[PDB]
Amino acid sequence: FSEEQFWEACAELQQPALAGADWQLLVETSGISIYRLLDKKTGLYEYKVFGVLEDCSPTLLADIYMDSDYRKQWDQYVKELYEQECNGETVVYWEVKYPFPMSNRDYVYLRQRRDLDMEGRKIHVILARSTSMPQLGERSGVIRVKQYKQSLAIESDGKKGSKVFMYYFDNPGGQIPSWLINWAAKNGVPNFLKDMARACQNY
């Protein structure tokens, strides 16, 4: 994870670039919006998350975004989650619960935080990216997501919470039913952001 990449995760935090392509909104909740951009040739999507979360310190949100022990405790979709050091870098293992019949997806990835000061503005950036380890091969029954990259930026909203900007992408290695995106858009994520807000109140 280079310097530049961290800097790059701050751009849309101030100003949302979405005009270059067909980003369509998909969700608005708790003052958070999710845009998605379909890659017509692969059926694959990219997501962008903007918004605010009052009632949750930028600095809280960051620490919690990093706390696996805690995440395992409050996040209902985590089936398994743990960290190990490999070389000098932290490697995260995360298995996500999928609505059966669908098999869960699990991730092996590098995750790194950096609290920045961009012109006196104190921001928090976390980038994630896929990696592989010979000791951690694929598990039968679970779908290993081999392509995954994410970035997230947290600034205060000046008031009680924090404004964020998240960029997301992975190849779930199998079709994702529209119904699941519909459950996700309309109930899944809305309820998540809530438990998370609430999990932030009880740190």
Ligand X SMILES: CCCCC/C=C\C/C=C\CCCCCCCC(=O)OC[C@H](COP(=O)([O-])OCC[N+](C)(C)C)OC(=O)CCCCCCC/C=C\C/C=C\CCCCC
Alpha-carbon distance 56 to 141, whole Å?
37
Q: 19 to each of 15, 79, 125, how far by Cα in Å?
A: 12, 37, 24
Please tell me whether 77 is known to bind a ligand.
no
Please tell me whether 121 is known to bind a ligand.
no
| Residue closer to ligand X, measured from CB, 136 or 181 | 181
C-beta of 172: minimal distance to ligand X in Å? 7
C-beta of 177: minimal distance to ligand X in Å? 9
C-beta of 148: minimal distance to ligand X in Å? 6
Please tell me whether 65 is known to bind a ligand.
yes
Helix, strand or coil, per DSSP, at residue 183: helix
C-beta of 185: minimal distance to ligand X in Å? 4
Alpha-carbon distance 203 to 173, whole Å?
35
| Residue closer to ligand X, measured from CB, 9 or 34 | 34
Using CB under 6 A, list all residues that contact ligand X: 26-27, 32, 34, 47, 49, 61, 77, 94, 96, 98, 107, 152, 154, 164, 166, 168, 176, 180-181, 184-185, 188-189, 192-193
Query: For residue 168, which of 182, 148, 198 has the smallest C-alpha distance?
Result: 148
Q: In terms of DSSP bridges, do strands 89-96 and 105-116 run parallel, antiparallel, or are they unpaired? A: antiparallel
Do 201 and 61 meet the contact criterion of CB atoms below 8 Å apart?
no
CB-closest chain residue to ligand X: 192
Helix, strand or coil, per DSSP, at residue 103: coil
Query: For residue 170, which of 125, 105, 124 has the smallest C-alpha distance?
Result: 105
C-beta of 129: minimal distance to ligand X in Å? 11
Q: Where are the alpha helices (DSSP H) in 67-142?
A: 68-74
Residues contributing to the annotated binding site for a 1,2-diacyl-sn-glycero-3-phosphocholine: 65, 71, 150
Residues contributing to the annotated binding site: 65, 71, 150
